[PDB]
Symmetry: C3
Subunit: 143 residues, 3 copies
Amino acid sequence: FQGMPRWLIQHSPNTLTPEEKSHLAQQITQAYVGFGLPAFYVQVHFIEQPAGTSFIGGEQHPNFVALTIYHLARTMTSDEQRQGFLKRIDAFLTPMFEPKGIDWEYFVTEAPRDLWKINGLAPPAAGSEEEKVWVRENRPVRF
Amino acid sequence: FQGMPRWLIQHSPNTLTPEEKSHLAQQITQAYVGFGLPAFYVQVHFIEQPAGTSFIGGEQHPNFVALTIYHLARTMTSDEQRQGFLKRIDAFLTPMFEPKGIDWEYFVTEAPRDLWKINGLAPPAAGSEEEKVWVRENRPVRF
Amino acid sequence: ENLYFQGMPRWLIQHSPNTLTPEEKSHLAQQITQAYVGFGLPAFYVQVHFIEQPAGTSFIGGEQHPNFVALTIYHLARTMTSDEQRQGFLKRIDAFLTPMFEPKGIDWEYFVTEAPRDLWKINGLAPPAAGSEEEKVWVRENRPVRF
Ligand SMILES: [Cl-]
Ligand code: NA
């Protein structure tokens, strides 16, 4: 896997504790770290939707999580990669949400590779020597 | 019409009442239910932007609604389908906002159908008998 | 330039508490606006919305990061890719983002995501073609004008 993952997680009040949010973000992060990404690429942001602000099927829902996942274009081109990705994220989303009766939905949207920068730097190529330096330092390194 | 609609609606303070948000969400939901979707697919989330956090033309705007509509890719390929969709949403957005003096903007962004799941399930093919079960039960039926 | 400054644009800027002051948010929004205005866009097309993320709601490499800005830039889909024009777009936005964030020790990330022009409307009107006479009317009036 290469490129940015940015997750936005909107949810009802009294649905995820601060500890569950941290746990979820860290399982998301682990998944990408396992694909070889520098961990600091992974951003997960939660937004609690006050009651009155969220509608599913036209009605307020008190127990939902809506995830939007932003990737870069052509980062998971094969059916095998895409299927593997869904397996890997279901492995931590399902066991968190199902015991809570949570209804959840995710989808992945893809963005052009060449318009992404971190601290004003275009990140290095997957597998490159420069990426190993970024991983080691866990920060954007200027060369 | 394939796939999920997820709407994000950002707006200024003192611009939409809780009653107007609920009514808007019901109208959006009715639009997609009329296309044949299960009601529960339709998500609409509002975020009020405090004064000092929203800028249009570089100035704070006290009376705006900014909409982001997330659809699946390849769901409206013909000009006729696309034009019909825009007519159908303008039919409720314009009469709500115009008399209030609101400035509103929407656009539609697209995501691949194969990376979309609800409650850990890939939803049924559009127009399928399996989809009809999801419409009828208004929930993600495991099968 | 060109292909990359046609619109919409919509900027979403998520950030930690006590990271950007209200004055800085306003100054950034004006800088972003001027960048697109310089390429002939009507000023009112440029929307910039900030969302403060409370402590405990933001994770970067698993860290609850207290000093970050995460930007999402929504643009119109392009007919083609141009490295020359793209580099011009990135140079112009880095010219204001970097000087604001770097002296504050902020870690920041942006990317651009694209949307089809034909499903975009402002006040219920499809905006005029990039570079057209109709667009010049919208520039002058700084609002959507029916034809
Ligand atoms: Cl692909
Ligand atoms: Na490009």
